[PDB]
Subunit: 95 residues, 2 copies
């Protein structure tokens, strides 16, 4: 198996506003969506789970760095796939 | 092994307009993008590649079946991942919002 696809549920798509505060409820919801997706214990993240979270943090940072300038968004989306369960979610910064 | 994530380039996100005809060039454009992304042989698709393209054709038909029902759809995105190379693309059905407002509801 080299080729994965998933049809993603409306509820598994999260629209991300990088203008929202880092401390915001918006961003808390995004992080929770991801932990749930990974079926992870936040207090005891595996190394694979850590990599996902770090990648998510880097994704956010770039969203902010792009929106800081009046640029477009270079990487407008974040995909996470649970390869055990096939659960896929997609965070998107609209436009 | 268990957890994949990808930061997706803008050009690897495809906007899909489900209101196009079943037979539209647009859908064939989307189809090719997926064939390309799999590095697949449209002539001799493997089982795994054929599963992907059937997933997709099904994805499109559900957009249309669902768009007759509501302004949103049940499954608005289609994710493809080359698990060998990490390459990911994302087909998304969004409404384009255009027009004017006086600044009230």
């Amino acid at each position: 198996m080299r080729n994965f696809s998933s049809r993603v549920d409306l509820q598994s798509i999260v629209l991300v506003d990088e203008s929202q505060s880092i401390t915001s409820d918006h961003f808390r919801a995004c992080w929770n969506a991801l932990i749930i997706a990974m079926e992870a214990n936040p207090s005891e993240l595996s190394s694979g789970e850590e990599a996902v979270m770090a990648d998510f943090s880097e994704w956010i940072a770039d969203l902010k760095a792009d929106a800081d300038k009046a640029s477009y968004v270079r990487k407008p989306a974040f995909v996470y796939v649970n390869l055990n369960t096939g659960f896929t979610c997609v965070f998107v910064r609209l436009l």
